[PDB]
């Protein structure tokens, strides 16, 4: 009734049939957290929304080297409602873990309940600017994915990758240029930000624009090298 | 009043059907994907086929650049036409839903303006250049 196809990034599948969808496995069946549908072929599967997750349009916008691998450990900054976090727990599975943080309270409560539902998650609900009150908890992660709309993305990502990220670690950042500047070319804002990170010791591999899914948004990926 | 309730009900049905169609169905991405390569000579010597280590068709394809190592339709009946006809027709069904919704929106605009001409107030009938009329109420507090 439906064909599956594996994807270059492992843990990412595409259902090809009468209608094409981007899909992952699941760990705790008999559920659906955010009203998203599913498909069960036999094994359960769960689709994303690139209109609702940034990382999805990261993938299906065509993204060469994402470093979230199934076994690994992934920090997540700016997890409002944790829908993308649920997708992260699906794509890591039980041998990898996810470290999802949120500042405010209502996405925090929803985060907490979904973390109750799932094993792979530990939620940090403390503020994101200060990394100490959870260096107590987080343990020596592999990769970092962050979307914060606060304009100190360079500073927050610098501090969190300094404190936690493995050497030769993976870092993937989102950007909304319309939050940063809202005067000039979104390309110009993006080039300004890759210069920030390149000063801040992250070697930038790839830049990508999510043009038919969001407006003016960028995803930047890179390696992290030789720090403490 | 009963008329505009009817129209708005139909529009809300169609709006939700549009949302669910877009949720079900996938659109192709189109974004600038720019590589950061340090040395000018290897920048000049770039090829996508080695970099994404694939074949030129699968290179221009951008939802699955499954590698050669990854690489190392008979299911759907007549996939050349039936599958593609179905793909396009799902797209057209979402589009047709959309036009239904915009038209019902406009009908409700006209009906709502009339209902409020009926209500009260001291109106004024102003006439635009283009032929379109409009009303503008006197500056008064409703009591």
């Amino acid at each position: 009734k439906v064909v599956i196809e594996p994807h270059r990034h492992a843990g990412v599948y595409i259902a090809r049939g009468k209608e094409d969808l981007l899909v992952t496995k699941n760990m705790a069946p008999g559920e659906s957290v955010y009203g998203e549908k599913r498909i069960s072929v036999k094994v359960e599967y769960r689709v994303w929304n690139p209109f609702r997750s940034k990382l999805a349009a990261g993938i299906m916008g065509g993204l060469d080297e994402l470093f979230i691998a199934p076994g690994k450990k992934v920090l997540y900054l700016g997890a409002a409602s944790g829908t993308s976090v649920s997708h992260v727990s699906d794509v890591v599975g039980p041998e990898g873990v996810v470290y999802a943080v949120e500042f405010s309270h209502r996405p925090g409560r929803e985060l907490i309940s979904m973390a109750k539902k799932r094993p792979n998650i530990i939620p940090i609900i403390e503020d994101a600017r200060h990394p100490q009150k959870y260096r107590m908890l987080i343990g020596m992660v592999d990769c970092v994915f962050a979307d914060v709309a606060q304009p100190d993305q360079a500073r927050i990502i610098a501090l969190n990758s300094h404190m936690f990220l493995k050497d030769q670690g993976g870092v993937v950042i989102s950007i909304k240029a319309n939050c940063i500047d809202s005067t000039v070319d979104a390309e110009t804002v993006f080039a300004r930000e890759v210069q920030k990170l390149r000063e801040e010791r992250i070697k930038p591999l790839e830049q990508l624009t999510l043009e038919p899914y969001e407006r003016d948004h960028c995803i930047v990926v890179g390696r992290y090298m030789r720090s403490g | 009043t009963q008329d505009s309730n009817y129209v708005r009900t139909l529009r809300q049905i169609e709006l939700k059907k549009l949302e669910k169609g877009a949720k079900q169905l996938m659109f192709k991405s189109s974004g600038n994907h720019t590589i950061f390569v340090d040395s000018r000579e290897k920048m000049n010597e770039f090829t996508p086929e080695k970099f994404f280590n694939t074949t030129s068709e699968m290179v221009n394809r951008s939802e699955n650049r499954l590698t050669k190592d990854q690489l190392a339709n008979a299911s759907s009946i007549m996939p050349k036409e039936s599958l593609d006809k179905k793909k396009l027709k799902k797209f057209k069904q979402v589009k047709q839903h959309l036009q239904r919704e915009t038209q019902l929106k406009q009908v409700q605009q006209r009906m709502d303006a009339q209902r409020e001409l009926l209500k009260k107030g001291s109106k004024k009938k102003i006439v635009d250049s283009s032929g379109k009329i409009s009303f503008k109420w006197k500056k008064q507090r409703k009591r």
């Binding site: 196809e5 | 068709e57 499954l66 339709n73 996939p79 793909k87």
Partner: peptide
């Protein structure tokens, strides 16, 4: 080496038909 390139072309067409169009990729 031809065994590689033959298998290369093999699954290529097995996926080329699964996810493409020509007359439909316009509309």
């Amino acid at each position: 080496r031809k065994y590689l390139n033959k298998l290369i072309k093999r699954n290529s067409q097995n996926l080329r038909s699964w996810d493409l169009e020509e007359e439909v990729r316009d509309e």
